[PDB]
Amino acid sequence: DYKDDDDKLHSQANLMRLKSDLFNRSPMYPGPTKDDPLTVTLGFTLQDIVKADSSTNEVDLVYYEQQRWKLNSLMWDPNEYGNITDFRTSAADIWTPDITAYSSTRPVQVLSPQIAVVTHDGSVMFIPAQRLSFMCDPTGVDSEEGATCAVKFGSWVYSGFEIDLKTDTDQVDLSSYYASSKYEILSATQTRQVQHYSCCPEPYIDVNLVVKFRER
Amino acid sequence: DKLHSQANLMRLKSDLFNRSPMYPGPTKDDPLTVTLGFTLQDIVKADSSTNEVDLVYYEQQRWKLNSLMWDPNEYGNITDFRTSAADIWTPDITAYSSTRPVQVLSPQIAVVTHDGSVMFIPAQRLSFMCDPTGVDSEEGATCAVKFGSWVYSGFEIDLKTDTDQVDLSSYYASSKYEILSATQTRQVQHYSCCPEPYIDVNLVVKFRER
Amino acid sequence: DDDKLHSQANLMRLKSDLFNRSPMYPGPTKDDPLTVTLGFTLQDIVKADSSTNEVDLVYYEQQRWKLNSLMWDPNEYGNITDFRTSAADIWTPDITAYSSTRPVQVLSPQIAVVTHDGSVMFIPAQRLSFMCDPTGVDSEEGATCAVKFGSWVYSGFEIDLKTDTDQVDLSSYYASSKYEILSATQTRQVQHYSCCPEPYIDVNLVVKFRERR
Amino acid sequence: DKLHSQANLMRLKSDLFNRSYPGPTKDDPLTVTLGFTLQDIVKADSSTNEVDLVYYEQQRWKLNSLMWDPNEYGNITDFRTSAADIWTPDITAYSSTRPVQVLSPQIAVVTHDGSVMFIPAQRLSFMCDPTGVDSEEGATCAVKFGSWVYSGFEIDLKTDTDQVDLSSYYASSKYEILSATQTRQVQHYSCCPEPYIDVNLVVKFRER
Amino acid sequence: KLHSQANLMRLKSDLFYPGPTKDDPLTVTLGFTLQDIVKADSSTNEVDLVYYEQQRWKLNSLMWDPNEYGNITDFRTSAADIWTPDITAYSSTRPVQVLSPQIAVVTHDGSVMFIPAQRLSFMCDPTGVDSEEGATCAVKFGSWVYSGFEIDLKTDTDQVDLSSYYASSKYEILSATQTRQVQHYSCCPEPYIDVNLVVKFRERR
Numbered sequence A: 001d002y003k004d005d006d007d008k009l010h011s012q013a014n015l016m017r018l019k020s021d022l023f024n025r026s027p028m029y030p031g032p033t034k035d036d037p038l039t040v041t042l043g044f045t046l047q048d049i050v051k052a053d054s055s056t057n058e059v060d061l062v063y064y065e066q067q068r069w070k071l072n073s074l075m076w077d078p079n080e081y082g083n084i085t086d087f088r089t090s091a092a093d094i095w096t097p098d099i100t101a102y103s104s105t106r107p108v109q110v111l112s113p114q115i116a117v118v119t120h121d122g123s124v125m126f127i128p129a130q131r132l133s134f135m136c137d138p139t140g141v142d143s144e145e146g147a148t149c150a151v152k153f154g155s156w157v158y159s160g161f162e163i164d165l166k167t168d169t170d171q172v173d174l175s176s177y178y179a180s181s182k183y184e185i186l187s188a189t190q191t192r193q194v195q196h197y198s199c200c201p202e203p204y205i206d207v208n209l210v211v212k213f214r215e216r
Numbered sequence B: 001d002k003l004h005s006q007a008n009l010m011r012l013k014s015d016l017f018n019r020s021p022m023y024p025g026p027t028k029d030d031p032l033t034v035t036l037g038f039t040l041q042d043i044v045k046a047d048s049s050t051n052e053v054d055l056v057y058y059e060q061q062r063w064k065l066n067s068l069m070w071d072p073n074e075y076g077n078i079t080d081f082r083t084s085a086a087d088i089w090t091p092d093i094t095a096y097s098s099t100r101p102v103q104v105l106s107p108q109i110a111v112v113t114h115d116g117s118v119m120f121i122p123a124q125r126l127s128f129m130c131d132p133t134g135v136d137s138e139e140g141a142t143c144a145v146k147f148g149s150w151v152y153s154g155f156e157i158d159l160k161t162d163t164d165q166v167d168l169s170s171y172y173a174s175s176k177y178e179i180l181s182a183t184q185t186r187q188v189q190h191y192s193c194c195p196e197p198y199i200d201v202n203l204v205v206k207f208r209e210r
Numbered sequence C: 001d002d003d004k005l006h007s008q009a010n011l012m013r014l015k016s017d018l019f020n021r022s023p024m025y026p027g028p029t030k031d032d033p034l035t036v037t038l039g040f041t042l043q044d045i046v047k048a049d050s051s052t053n054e055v056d057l058v059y060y061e062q063q064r065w066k067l068n069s070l071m072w073d074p075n076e077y078g079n080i081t082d083f084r085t086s087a088a089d090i091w092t093p094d095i096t097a098y099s100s101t102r103p104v105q106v107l108s109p110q111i112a113v114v115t116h117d118g119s120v121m122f123i124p125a126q127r128l129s130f131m132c133d134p135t136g137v138d139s140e141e142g143a144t145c146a147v148k149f150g151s152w153v154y155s156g157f158e159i160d161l162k163t164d165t166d167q168v169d170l171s172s173y174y175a176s177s178k179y180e181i182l183s184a185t186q187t188r189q190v191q192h193y194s195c196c197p198e199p200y201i202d203v204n205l206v207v208k209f210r211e212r213r
Numbered sequence D: 001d002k003l004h005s006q007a008n009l010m011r012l013k014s015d016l017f018n019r020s021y022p023g024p025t026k027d028d029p030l031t032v033t034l035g036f037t038l039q040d041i042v043k044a045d046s047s048t049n050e051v052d053l054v055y056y057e058q059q060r061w062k063l064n065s066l067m068w069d070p071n072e073y074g075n076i077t078d079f080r081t082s083a084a085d086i087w088t089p090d091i092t093a094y095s096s097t098r099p100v101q102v103l104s105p106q107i108a109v110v111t112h113d114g115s116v117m118f119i120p121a122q123r124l125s126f127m128c129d130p131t132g133v134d135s136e137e138g139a140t141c142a143v144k145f146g147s148w149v150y151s152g153f154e155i156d157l158k159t160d161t162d163q164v165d166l167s168s169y170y171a172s173s174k175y176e177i178l179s180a181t182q183t184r185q186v187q188h189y190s191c192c193p194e195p196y197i198d199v200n201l202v203v204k205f206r207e208r
Numbered sequence E: 001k002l003h004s005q006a007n008l009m010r011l012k013s014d015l016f017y018p019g020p021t022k023d024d025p026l027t028v029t030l031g032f033t034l035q036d037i038v039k040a041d042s043s044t045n046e047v048d049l050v051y052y053e054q055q056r057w058k059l060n061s062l063m064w065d066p067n068e069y070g071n072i073t074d075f076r077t078s079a080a081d082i083w084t085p086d087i088t089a090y091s092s093t094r095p096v097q098v099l100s101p102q103i104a105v106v107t108h109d110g111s112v113m114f115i116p117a118q119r120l121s122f123m124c125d126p127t128g129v130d131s132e133e134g135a136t137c138a139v140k141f142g143s144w145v146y147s148g149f150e151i152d153l154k155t156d157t158d159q160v161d162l163s164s165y166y167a168s169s170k171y172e173i174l175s176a177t178q179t180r181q182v183q184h185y186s187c188c189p190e191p192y193i194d195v196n197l198v199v200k201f202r203e204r205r
């Protein structure tokens, strides 16, 4: 009825007003500082080991990388915005963390839309799907124990003083692993590590993705 | 009256994209149904070293927004127009088992109709996860790829097919592979992570060496 | 020197009046349809892949059309009869290959020539991979393949296509190509589709070729 | 003084770019000087008759709109600028088989007399039959370079020498250069009444 | 924590260069961290390296007083936001592929540190890679458009950092040096500066 038509128009206006209030009126987050450190939660969903190249020692993975963080500057009261509790927005509208593979051999290829979900508590969920080529010797992939490779993910430019990394579990999600891959997974772990590098005095944080796999 | 026709279309586009506020995407309060259909043009390549298959197809997408409606009488009886896909909201329909970024083979232009219906038909080359084992036998190989929103649940975007049969009428007659069958089926799925329903369209292709 | 300074001001003034002082052209309509003239200059058959049935062509695609909105009187602008402009500054037709297997690769600058009669000429050089079974390329008869070109989104009611000739220009064909051309034609076709009421127009490029011996 | 030199350069660029070129015309034609430095023949593919070259292409032209009095800007005589801040000529290979790959930063040098020097390093795949590369006499291939859209009436081309600069040629390339020439040509095409100008690069090479 | 964010936002606004000149020349410190020789192609004499290239420079225009900005001593910013040097490989065969985010660290003294991870294909004959002596290849890095009078190049050390070299690479590094060189060309009277990266490598045994 007319009332239903009005409710939907009102709901669109409230979303456009919320996005306007958060992005246009307030300056974009300048990133974390020593005085305001940001925790980023990382989890991997391994979809496929596409290729294991024994001529270059590169292995190609397809995965989804779940990134979660919470900003005060993205908080709202749903009661002020027609009970909107979250919205979908372009990744380019918000700050995102510079989470990088430390041993890639080619630029990562993005396989999903660059859209994130922002929730009224200021929490952000971003899940880029990626194809990655990384440094991996697949010697032993044709064996019962298979091959073992590892790749570290973390901020490229922020130390543990500015960006802390967390995992909810040390188990890579294999519930979406392609059942007819050339490679079967023996195990896949994701482990937070804290290091000191020779160059620098700050602690450095990474999540180490370790995959044991063999030819099916 | 050609000057008037151009003026009427420039006025219509100006009215819709400036003087009317734009759509910000669907919500639980204002859910959107997207209709999807595939026209399979070619299975270009089936790689048994990586279990990747390369498809060329076009994907018909259709949806309807109240904000893209107009009265043709008020605009010299214009009933539709073509516009850049960047001038309008488009759904984030994604292959769930791609192994490479989709390559776009057609112009990013949509057709908008006076009822607010949009039709967008991107032609694509897709590499996806597929074991071609059996492709060199009479019963052939079977592979499947799901398509849906990456970021919207069933509470914001619903999907539909207008038919469950993939359009094979443009399938390349001299492909290295013949199609035994091609289906496109709406599926409702729950994931352990999340409470909301998730909707996809499952493209299932059975094929063999010509 | 003063003359050169005057000629530049006139061109900058013409371009500004045409683009800055005019609302952007919305494309053709059923009431204001456009004819696009297409012609192909085939430079090379670079690759014929029998494992995927893909063939790679290098060609120049000439496109011509005319808009009243790009017309000017040369006498009003220092007797300027034409100018070069970025293809982004003007409307261009969405002429697409219908059976490509990869995005077209652009080999030339995206710049067009506009004449005072409102006519535009645009000649993109392209590498195209398209669906082609090269079986018989190593025989006297050779292989035959075909690719249709037309608007992706406009019907025959908005965009008509024409050719000046049904003969593909082979005068630039690479004399030392792996493949020699037995024939190459470009033919306007009118098609009807069960989906849709209006006629659809394409230009069918048919190439007969064999391995150079 | 370092602050002043920076102030003067910023003011010169604002004066040249933000104070007020639509390209050459029949009434205002431009001469472009081209010179090639051949660094490597990377690949010669006898299965497709494509050859891959790495070279840098020196481009020089002169505009009245780019000239200034150095005395008015702290005696600045030249500056570096992004190639996107200025008009650049649409010099194209006429027989490329793939889009050119740019190997260098897109930055030009502008001098107070209005002269511009722009030296893009490129990898080019072009149409070339390497038949005979495995013999004493070697293979011969050629590629024309010129404006894609401007005739001889708007852009003329010049070389400073007909000798391609080989002083930077990779000493351990798979291919040794027997000769490399760059020759201005006046072309007539049966499509078109205008004269067309190109520089023809002819390379004679063989397997080392 | 609201005060810290406000002060950082204020600093970046206040701060936000036309590049170096003969009168305002710049020094760029380069250091290489070699991670992997991925590929050596004897059919084309092209070798593919993965490395991190550390670039450091100092601008007076990027200086601030930390006391005026709530004791902020540095910040991270998009490389797009600031001037960066046009340091280029002189013998690449393909465009460099960037493997890391284009973000730099700016310090209150006006110093900038930018560390792009890159994959480079460059001109290299790998003959002898399967021998005890291995193969030797070299690639020069420098400004494409600035002479030694506008950009000086230097290294902190002539030893390439190998502490991150992939232990299971197809190729082991026998040595890797990074050496400032001064050169002259017939065209040009002013001196040109490059850092010459020399790598001696061989098949892992």
Ligand SMILES: *[C@@H]1O[C@H](CO)[C@@H](O[C@@H]2O[C@H](CO)[C@@H](O[C@@H]3O[C@H](CO)[C@@H](O)[C@H](O[C@H]4O[C@H](CO)[C@@H](O)[C@H](O)[C@@H]4O)[C@@H]3O)[C@H](O)[C@H]2NC(C)=O)[C@H](O)[C@H]1NC(C)=O
Binding pocket: B073, B076, B077
């Ligand atoms: C936009 O579209 C609308 C809707 O189609 C259109 O309005 C229509 O115009 C036609 C033509 O004038 C109208 O048709 C007339 O209808 C009346 C009855 O209502 C008849 O008596 C008329 O017949 C006489 O005139 C004809 C010549 O026009 C003769 O051939 C005939 O022998 C009779 O003498 C005639 O058929 C129609 O009624 C309207 N419809 C509506 C809903 O208003 C409009 O013109 C279009 N253009 C624009 C820019 O809006």
Ligand SMILES: CC1=NCCC[C@@]12CCCCC21OCCO1
Binding pocket: A102, A154, A155, A156, A157, A197, A199, A200, A204, E115
């Ligand atoms: C640049 C960088 N990014 C990832 C982790 C740490 C590292 C990588 C190498 C070790 C130290 C480092 O930090 C500052 C300089 O380099």
Ligand SMILES: CC1=NCCC[C@@]12CCCCC21OCCO1
Binding pocket: A045, A064, A127, B096, B148, B149, B150, B151, B191, B193, B194, B198
């Ligand atoms: C991101 C996503 N998009 C579409 C399918 C479902 C999936 C894919 C991964 C598993 C579940 C998921 O739903 C919400 C969070 O992620």
Ligand SMILES: CC1=NCCC[C@@]12CCCCC21OCCO1
Binding pocket: B121, B170, C098, C150, C151, C152, C153, C193, C195, C196, C200
């Ligand atoms: C999309 C499309 N592009 C080229 C011509 C027409 C065609 C080609 C395929 C069938 C008909 C079609 O028209 C509307 C739907 O698709």
Ligand SMILES: CC1=NCCC[C@@]12CCCCC21OCCO1
Binding pocket: C041, C060, C123, C172, D146, D147, D148, D149, D189, D191, D192, D196
């Ligand atoms: C487009 C083009 N540009 C450079 C001269 C050669 C060529 C290429 C084909 C022959 C003639 C031509 O000149 C104008 C029209 O086309």
Ligand SMILES: CC1=NCCC[C@@]12CCCCC21OCCO1
Binding pocket: D037, D056, D119, E142, E143, E144, E145, E185, E187, E188, E192
């Ligand atoms: C463009 C260029 N940049 C760096 C040194 C090598 C080179 C390439 C050609 C030789 C000299 C040169 O220096 C300035 C002008 O040209």
Ligand SMILES: [Cl-]
Binding pocket: A028, A029, A071, A074, A093, A094, A095
């Ligand atoms: Cl943000």
Ligand SMILES: [Cl-]
Binding pocket: A160, A194, A203
């Ligand atoms: Cl810690």
Ligand SMILES: [Cl-]
Binding pocket: B022, B023, B065, B068, B087, B088, B089
């Ligand atoms: Cl919209």
Ligand SMILES: [Cl-]
Binding pocket: C025, C067, C070, C089, C090, C091
């Ligand atoms: Cl136009």
Ligand SMILES: [Cl-]
Binding pocket: D021, D063, D066, D085, D086, D087
């Ligand atoms: Cl200019």
Ligand SMILES: [Cl-]
Binding pocket: E017, E059, E062, E081, E082, E083
């Ligand atoms: Cl800066």
